[PDB]
Design a protein around this ligand. Sequence first.
Ligand SMILES: CC[C@H](C)[C@H](N)C(=O)O
Ligand SMILES: CC[C@H](C)[C@H](N)C(=O)O
Ligand SMILES: CC[C@H](C)[C@H](N)C(=O)O
Ligand SMILES: CC[C@H](C)[C@H](N)C(=O)O
Ligand SMILES: CC[C@H](C)[C@H](N)C(=O)O
Ligand SMILES: CC[C@H](C)[C@H](N)C(=O)O
Ligand SMILES: CC[C@H](C)[C@H](N)C(=O)O
Ligand SMILES: CC[C@H](C)[C@H](N)C(=O)O
Lengths: 229, 229, 251, 230
Amino acid sequence: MSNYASFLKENGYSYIPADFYQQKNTDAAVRELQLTYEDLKADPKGGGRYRAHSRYILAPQSDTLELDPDNGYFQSKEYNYDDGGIVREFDKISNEFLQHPVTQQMIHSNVEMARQTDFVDWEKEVIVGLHQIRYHVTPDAPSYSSPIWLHRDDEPLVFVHLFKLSEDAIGGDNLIAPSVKQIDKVLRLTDPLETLALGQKVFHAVTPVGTANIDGAHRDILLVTFSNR
Amino acid sequence: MSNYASFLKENGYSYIPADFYQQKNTDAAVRELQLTYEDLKADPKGGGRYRAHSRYILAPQSDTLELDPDNGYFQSKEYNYDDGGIVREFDKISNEFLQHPVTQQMIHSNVEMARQTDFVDWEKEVIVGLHQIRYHVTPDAPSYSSPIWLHRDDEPLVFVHLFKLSEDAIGGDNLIAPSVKQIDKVLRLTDPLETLALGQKVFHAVTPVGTANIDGAHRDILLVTFSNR
Amino acid sequence: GLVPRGSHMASMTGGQQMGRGSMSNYASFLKENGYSYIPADFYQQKNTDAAVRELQLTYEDLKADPKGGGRYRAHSRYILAPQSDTLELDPDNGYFQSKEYNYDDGGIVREFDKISNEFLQHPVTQQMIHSNVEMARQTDFVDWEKEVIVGLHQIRYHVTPDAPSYSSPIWLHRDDEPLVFVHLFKLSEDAIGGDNLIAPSVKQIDKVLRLTDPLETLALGQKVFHAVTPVGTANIDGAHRDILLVTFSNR
Amino acid sequence: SMSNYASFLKENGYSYIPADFYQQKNTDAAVRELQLTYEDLKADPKGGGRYRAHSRYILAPQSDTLELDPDNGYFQSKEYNYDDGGIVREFDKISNEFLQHPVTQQMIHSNVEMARQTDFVDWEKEVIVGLHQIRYHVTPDAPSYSSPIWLHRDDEPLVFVHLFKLSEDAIGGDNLIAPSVKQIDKVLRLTDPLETLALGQKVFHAVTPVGTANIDGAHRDILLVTFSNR
Ligand SMILES: CC[C@H](C)[C@H](N)C(=O)O
Ligand SMILES: CC[C@H](C)[C@H](N)C(=O)O
Ligand SMILES: CC[C@H](C)[C@H](N)C(=O)O
Ligand SMILES: CC[C@H](C)[C@H](N)C(=O)O
Ligand SMILES: CC[C@H](C)[C@H](N)C(=O)O
Ligand SMILES: CC[C@H](C)[C@H](N)C(=O)O
Ligand SMILES: CC[C@H](C)[C@H](N)C(=O)O
Ligand SMILES: CC[C@H](C)[C@H](N)C(=O)O
């Protein structure tokens, strides 16, 4: 674990294999979560995205995640250049998803890694934000991130957990870049729970998702953000 | 009066000159209120702000403002993206301030304007919230709003009464905007009781206050909010 | 079906009658007998299990009842103005019962958490409240000329082999609130107790009856005594009985 | 000695104060003027045979100027007053004759001083000195009782109960002090004008319902002086 957190601290990003999360979980348990993605509602701003958001609060010397009843999501336009600057109302992440043992195990593993970093002030309240996202595609309409290309997120540390990737889906390559003129890493998450942690040090992106097949394809992910108040 | 309420209804905001409030009030009476600003305590969340809050309740077919003994102030993260989502404890607005004839005259003029709008449901309880705010600035630390930039407030109608603006103060320009990519109105309150009404239709902000003179400066305002339960 | 609608016997295996019952049937039974069993049919008719399961999970977040008993809860109340259908959520949350009714924790005001808006605003919850409201209106159990308080108690009885859970108050009682609806939301298969009792006196028991399937309901008027037998469990991982009370009373 | 009563109050959460301490200088004729104002009081909306007025003063942090609040709404949370709490009650205002009368003013300042020798309110902040002129009015068919009816605590951390009159054929109006709702430590009945009882939130208190033998009616007239923050 500290290996990945060290790599993250120096490079500003870290690939984390599914091993590290799946070690303790059957595929059937992970598949239950995968199915929740079918119920997600459309992202207002579009892009073929289907979302939920829920955040927990971590009081300074506490391990009790306290679920925030408010759901509005905001990023400044200084980071998210597409949909930033305004508050977005998404649905809440189903309790099935939130409370599922896998989800909870992933959150605490992320929390521990996050604690081995100075990426947030642990003296103050920490917001553990979760984004359940499906990029949904059909040959006529592809899907892409908000924002679309290389960016940084407001949240100093973001974990990208893959949950599913349809075998006839293209794109969804993650990019790591030190500037907007050059790309250091291309890397594509394909198997469930393959993860990528991202610090503000670098730029990151996700290549737009598309599909050959007319019946559609999808890329399902879970973001786990860490930030202060 | 209906002039300003009409302008407000169409444009989503309205400049109201001091005349409309100082109508028969001497400057000495307005100056008494100005001095109360020196006693305000620091806003917990900072930004060089010094505050009090008090709210009144208006029962449906009543003109009796009934002072609420509870003082906690909340805005959803859906509107106030900085300090929203949590309840803030401020001091209460001094009785001197609340009961002063000027203050009371301003509240009732606001109430009347507000009643000529559909911005709140007058069938239900209406919360008339008051925020006495000093933006205080010193060469090391300027002052700014919560939230910092363009936003909407939970409260459908907000009146911004200026009480003082130090001759060596910069910023405190109010901005009116249809989106976060464009600004339609810039407008700066400078003379006591110059007012600006704000509906949820538009985005508004206040440009950070700072100072030309090394001795520092301040911008003192009274907000009068209108909202339902 | 030879058994009546509100009849506790409807909750007996091979004693059910078919189809949804009309509301007024149960309200009539309630008016005469002072209680009424209402099958999940009457509420679940229009609700998927997935929708009901969302609500079930909210029970995991409930905080401990100060007075204990393995209970975890929230409380929120709405107000119904005399000629209104607008439920207006009360910002005050203190819960009180006189010791003349609740002999354990009565006589003092209890501060609970508020019922999450997820729970309150959920379509199922709202549908149940309005069905209860309608039934309640067909009774003289409250004065509809005056303000009516529609109180909601989200309660989990949580149990482990070492520590069982029980009601406040513990045994047969009446509640201050003239009409109380008991909606079951979940009952873990290895939970014991949670039998509801109906009694005309404290020396005799007329009905024993156990809610097990989600949204199985029991309405209770002040006419009778009622109880809930303590919940316990065989299994060391715990069990639970999750309910929603919907009270009706005047100001 | 004043500090004696304030010390007793601080430790026990309540204190009996004899009429001596207030009547010391004031003639009975002066006290009787105030007593008569009770005949004009209007019915408490919520009932219970009560007849009321309310007025409150504000005490700025470093000030001895009581500033009369022109607003009159009275509120207690349901967390304390389990009967009529949770809503704002509109009562009449206490007549200026009553408020400004030297007796009344002397009582308020003596209460203020006692109150200041306690931590029962934050004197750094504004203090609300609330006054309730109350008549419990009774006839054999309809008795009178407090809001709330039985043992309770009030929102206001310190409450002074001054008796002004008690008709000789009036029963009840015993004040109770209790550590819980299962037990009663003190029973105590105010009968002579200006006999007082101070009450802190530490304990539970009640007033046993007032009733009467006589068909022409009887009454118990009191003045409450509350202290609380804002
Ligand atoms: C943490 C990533 C966030 C959610 C992303 N930039 C978005 O707003 O869609
Ligand atoms: C802004 C982060 C994005 C959404 C994430 N890295 C993804 O692969 O979809
Ligand atoms: C109604 C305006 C409020 C007070 C402002 N957005 C703040 O939170 O400071
Ligand atoms: C959010 C409203 C702000 C506080 C107000 N318009 C001002 O000028 O400061
Ligand atoms: C109306 C039932 C109430 C809520 C029950 N006596 C309790 O205190 O839990
Ligand atoms: C006091 C009523 C109780 C709480 C309810 N009948 C139950 O089944 O638990
Ligand atoms: C301070 C006591 C108050 C006045 C009392 N509980 C009432 O509501 O009447
Ligand atoms: C709640 C305070 C009551 C009314 C007062 N102590 C009395 O004896 O009358």
